[PDB]
Design a protein around this nucleic acid. Structure first.
Ligand SMILES: NC[C@@H]1O[C@H](O[C@H]2[C@@H](O)[C@H](O[C@@H]3[C@@H](O)[C@H](N)C[C@H](N)[C@H]3O[C@H]3O[C@H](CO)[C@@H](O)[C@H](O)[C@H]3N)O[C@@H]2CO)[C@H](N)[C@@H](O)[C@@H]1O
Ligand SMILES: NC[C@@H]1O[C@H](O[C@H]2[C@@H](O)[C@H](O[C@@H]3[C@@H](O)[C@H](N)C[C@H](N)[C@H]3O[C@H]3O[C@H](CO)[C@@H](O)[C@H](O)[C@H]3N)O[C@@H]2CO)[C@H](N)[C@@H](O)[C@@H]1O
Ligand SMILES: NC[C@@H]1O[C@H](O[C@H]2[C@@H](O)[C@H](O[C@@H]3[C@@H](O)[C@H](N)C[C@H](N)[C@H]3O[C@H]3O[C@H](CO)[C@@H](O)[C@H](O)[C@H]3N)O[C@@H]2CO)[C@H](N)[C@@H](O)[C@@H]1O
Ligand SMILES: NC[C@@H]1O[C@H](O[C@H]2[C@@H](O)[C@H](O[C@@H]3[C@@H](O)[C@H](N)C[C@H](N)[C@H]3O[C@H]3O[C@H](CO)[C@@H](O)[C@H](O)[C@H]3N)O[C@@H]2CO)[C@H](N)[C@@H](O)[C@@H]1O
Ligand SMILES: [Mg+2]
Ligand SMILES: [Mg+2]
Ligand SMILES: [Mg+2]
Ligand SMILES: [Mg+2]
Ligand SMILES: [Mg+2]
Ligand SMILES: [Mg+2]
Ligand SMILES: [Mg+2]
Ligand SMILES: [Mg+2]
Ligand SMILES: [Mg+2]
Ligand SMILES: [Mg+2]
Ligand SMILES: [Mg+2]
Ligand SMILES: [Mg+2]
Ligand SMILES: [Mg+2]
Ligand SMILES: [Mg+2]
Ligand SMILES: [Mg+2]
Ligand SMILES: [Mg+2]
Ligand SMILES: [Mg+2]
Ligand SMILES: [Mg+2]
Ligand SMILES: [Mg+2]
Ligand SMILES: [Mg+2]
Ligand SMILES: [Mg+2]
Ligand SMILES: [Mg+2]
Ligand SMILES: [Mg+2]
Ligand SMILES: [Mg+2]
Ligand SMILES: [Mg+2]
Ligand SMILES: [Mg+2]
Ligand SMILES: [Mg+2]
Ligand SMILES: [Mg+2]
Ligand SMILES: [Mg+2]
Ligand SMILES: [Mg+2]
Ligand SMILES: [Mg+2]
Ligand SMILES: [Mg+2]
Ligand SMILES: [Mg+2]
Ligand SMILES: [Mg+2]
Ligand SMILES: [Mg+2]
Ligand SMILES: [Mg+2]
Ligand SMILES: [Mg+2]
Ligand SMILES: [Mg+2]
Ligand SMILES: [Mg+2]
Ligand SMILES: [Mg+2]
Ligand SMILES: [Mg+2]
Ligand SMILES: [Mg+2]
Ligand SMILES: [Mg+2]
Ligand SMILES: [Mg+2]
Ligand SMILES: [Mg+2]
Ligand SMILES: [Mg+2]
Ligand SMILES: [Mg+2]
Ligand SMILES: [Mg+2]
Ligand SMILES: [Mg+2]
Ligand SMILES: [Mg+2]
Ligand SMILES: [Mg+2]
Ligand SMILES: [Mg+2]
Ligand SMILES: [Mg+2]
Ligand SMILES: [Mg+2]
Lengths: 88, 119, 73, 101
RNA sequence: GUGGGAGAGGGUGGUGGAAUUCCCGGAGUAGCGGUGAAAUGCGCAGAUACCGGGAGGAACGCCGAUGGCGAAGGCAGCCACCUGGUCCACCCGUGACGCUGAGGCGCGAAAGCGUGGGGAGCAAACCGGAUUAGAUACCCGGGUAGUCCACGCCCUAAACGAUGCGCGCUAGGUCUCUGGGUCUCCUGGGGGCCGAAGCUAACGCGUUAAGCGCGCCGCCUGGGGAGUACGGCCGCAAGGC
């Protein structure tokens, strides 16, 4: 599904400073990944609801984090969005 | 008029009737009996008595084909399954073995209401 | 009843994921085809649970019987 | 790329040519669904607990392979296409788990 | 984050044997079935019982539990793919990013609806046989929807722990599932049981609180009229809010 490698790419990509595991950036990138993987799963298997719950919870966590970013740093936020192709 | 002499005896048991079929070693029936074979009509066919009788008859008719050795299959849980066994045991026929074959599903079909509270 | 023989004391170390091993798995089926209870295997919760699956794989391949006729009775 | 185990039980009745033909079609199969063969056991004729295809015995092989997951099912589908093949069972390889140790 | 663990959590595809019914063939003959007792029913066009072959539907025995998973409804043969939640150790990274949550959106047993499909077993209605004072029933023989599949509606319930969510504080003993460690023991997550304090009208609850506390939502205000009337909203309808 998501390899220790795919993950490594995305973290070493989004980390503030090397070795940054859990910064707001990174978390939001892992999330986005998991979410797109999952919504892709759910364009087929539109009958699999219990997973879709996972999805809503996931988007909840994402938005939470972002509105926190917007709060603390409107820059890191705007940048990470455009880079991640969100806002929708 | 085969002259078999070595064969199979099938006892089938209900809370309704008991019925004994006897075959050759290949499963092909030679002679048989049941509770209604003897004069019993109503419920009486499920009696251990009725069973003993059907057993005995089936075996006697089977001596007429000259049978001696028989291996015994039993299906169904019934009154008089065991009296039919015991009957055959000395009918003068020699019972070489007995087996319980009573068929049980892995939950195939919703039984009638009569049999439910289980599947 | 069932305090007489526990199938765990029967052999020592044996692979419980091994569905190809007839004579060992076959140690867990009753006189009929039935997979024995935790009682008479004396397995652990999980051991038992694993036995279940490996025995069903064995069944499906044709190694272990699904149901067997009862002798005597 | 994961490790699986491919169980195949085919006709007790095959002679040398027919069987080494089946095995050949199996090789071709695995290969063309993308499986590398790590070890193999041909246990051959063995005695079935219940009759399969009216034959009381079966010819057993087992192959431990590495293949791409995404095609695994189709592979089995192919292995099963063959007439002479009466069982196919693919397992994801699991590490041995032993009681009494 | 990293590294490990358990699971009927979900979607799709494949697939195994048991059983029933049906068909084909063999052997076989006077009844089978069913009940309190019986009749209707099935059988001489050969039934039941028995052996061999085939077709199809539905459901997965043992394991299985005092068990596990899930927000809930709910989830059980086996295989693979896809996928959600969860837990433990490391104490690595973020730095209050938290809690609840009117409305909204999503799900939501069963029954029920629309289009097809499938239809073995069961079975409302229905057709019979019995029973009874009658018997629009309990019993018996049949049978249609349905139950099954896809897609779309329906939104209900003793939808129950009749117990909203989160966090903190308050003796213990024992059983169990499942992780971890220096593995007589210790330590973390879950399911039971008995009990300190305490609470409760009582029953009883008691670290899985119904105790002691804070936050936030929902809800109650004597019984019947009544989940009715009216209006609105939803629905193909049945109907729901
Ligand atoms: N394992 C198959 C499963 O099929 C499910 O549903 C499937 C089946 O239930 C349904 O009907 C199938 C079909 O092949 C065909 N029309 C008839 C066939 N008998 C059915 O398959 C059957 O299998 C078992 C017995 O093995 C039955 O108990 C059950 O009624 C049915 N699933 O059609 C669906 C697809 O063919 C789910 N999609 C999923 O869980 C999974 O793919
Ligand atoms: N996929 C179709 C499903 O069919 C279901 O049909 C179910 C119902 O007919 C019936 O439910 C009964 C229930 O009365 C009772 N309270 C419990 C009982 N164990 C259940 O029965 C079930 O038990 C298990 C399930 O794993 C099986 O072993 C067994 O075959 C099955 N009959 O068993 C069936 C098996 O699920 C339901 N409609 C729903 O689950 C779903 O629509
Ligand atoms: N789903 C039930 C079964 O679980 C077994 O294996 C499953 C579990 O043992 C295993 O759990 C792993 C866990 O070990 C590991 N340490 C972490 C991982 N997150 C977990 O997986 C879990 O979470 C992830 C998302 O994070 C989901 O994608 C996945 O569905 C879920 N099982 O994940 C597997 C798949 O879910 C069976 N072998 C498999 O066939 C089947 O999926
Ligand atoms: N094996 C016989 C079967 O007969 C079936 O017969 C079915 C159809 O003739 C009939 O459905 C018709 C529909 O075709 C027509 N276009 C309009 C009509 N108003 C429907 O009427 C039906 O609707 C429901 C299902 O929604 C049925 O269950 C019910 O019998 C009937 N009210 O309902 C019947 C019961 O299912 C089907 N041909 C098929 O399942 C199968 O061949
Ligand atoms: Mg959370
Ligand atoms: Mg705020
Ligand atoms: Mg600021
Ligand atoms: Mg009778
Ligand atoms: Mg599951
Ligand atoms: Mg397969
Ligand atoms: Mg069959
Ligand atoms: Mg015939
Ligand atoms: Mg007639
Ligand atoms: Mg007549
Ligand atoms: Mg024959
Ligand atoms: Mg047959
Ligand atoms: Mg007990
Ligand atoms: Mg106990
Ligand atoms: Mg729970
Ligand atoms: Mg429940
Ligand atoms: Mg730290
Ligand atoms: Mg931590
Ligand atoms: Mg700091
Ligand atoms: Mg602040
Ligand atoms: Mg919330
Ligand atoms: Mg619903
Ligand atoms: Mg329904
Ligand atoms: Mg319908
Ligand atoms: Mg019809
Ligand atoms: Mg019926
Ligand atoms: Mg009826
Ligand atoms: Mg009537
Ligand atoms: Mg009348
Ligand atoms: Mg009346
Ligand atoms: Mg009639
Ligand atoms: Mg609604
Ligand atoms: Mg609502
Ligand atoms: Mg409780
Ligand atoms: Mg509870
Ligand atoms: Mg609970
Ligand atoms: Mg509730
Ligand atoms: Mg929460
Ligand atoms: Mg405790
Ligand atoms: Mg105890
Ligand atoms: Mg106890
Ligand atoms: Mg340990
Ligand atoms: Mg506890
Ligand atoms: Mg529970
Ligand atoms: Mg108590
Ligand atoms: Mg007190
Ligand atoms: Mg008191
Ligand atoms: Mg109170
Ligand atoms: Mg109210
Ligand atoms: Mg209200
Ligand atoms: Mg009033
Ligand atoms: Mg109402
Ligand atoms: Mg109105
Ligand atoms: Mg309207």
């Amino acid at each position: 599904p998501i390899t220790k490698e795919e993950k490594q790419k995305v973290i070493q990509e989004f980390a503030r400073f090397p070795g940054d595991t859990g910064s707001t950036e990174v978390q939001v990138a892992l999330l986005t990944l998991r979410i797109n993987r999952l919504s892709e799963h759910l364009k087929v298997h539109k009958k699999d609801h219990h997973s879709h719950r996972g999805l809503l919870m996931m988007v909840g966590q994402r938005r939470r984090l972002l509105r926190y970013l917007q709060r603390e740093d409107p820059e890191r936020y705007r940048a990470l969005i455009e880079k991640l192709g969100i806002r929708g | 008029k085969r002259q078999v002499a070595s064969g199979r005896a099938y006892i089938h048991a209900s809370y309704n009737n008991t019925i004994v079929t006897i075959t050759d070693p290949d499963g092909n029936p030679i002679t048989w009996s049941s509770g209604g074979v003897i004069g019993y009509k109503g419920s009486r066919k499920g009696t251990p008595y009725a069973a003993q009788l059907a057993a005995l008859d089936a075996a006697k008719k089977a001596m007429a084909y000259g049978m001696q050795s028989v291996d015994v299959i039993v299906r169904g849980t019934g009154a008089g399954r065991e009296q039919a066994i015991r009957a055959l045991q000395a009918s003068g026929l020699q019972v070489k073995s007995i087996v319980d074959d009573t068929p049980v599903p892995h939950n195939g079909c919703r039984p009638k209401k009569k049999f439910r509270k289980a599947s | 009843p069932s305090r007489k023989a526990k199938v765990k004391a029967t052999l020592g170390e044996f692979d419980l994921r091994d569905y190809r091993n007839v004579e060992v798995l076959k140690r867990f089926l009753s006189e009929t085809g039935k997979i024995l209870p935790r009682r008479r295997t004396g397995l652990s919760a999980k051991e038992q649970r694993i036995l279940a699956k490996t025995i069903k794989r064995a069944r499906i391949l044709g190694l272990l019987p699904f149901t067997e006729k009862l002798v005597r009775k | 790329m994961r490790r699986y185990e491919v169980n195949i039980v085919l006709n007790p009745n095959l002679d040398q040519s027919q069987l080494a033909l089946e095995k050949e079609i199996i090789q071709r199969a695995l290969e063309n669904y993308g499986a590398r063969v790590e070890k193999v056991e041909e246990l051959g004729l063995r005695r079935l607990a219940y009759p399969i295809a009216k034959d009381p015995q079966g010819y057993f092989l087992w192959y431990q392979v590495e293949m791409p997951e995404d095609r695994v099912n189709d592979l089995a589908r192919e292995l099963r296409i063959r007439d002479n093949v009466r069982r196919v069972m693919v397992v994801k390889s699991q590490e041995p788990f032993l009681a009494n140790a």
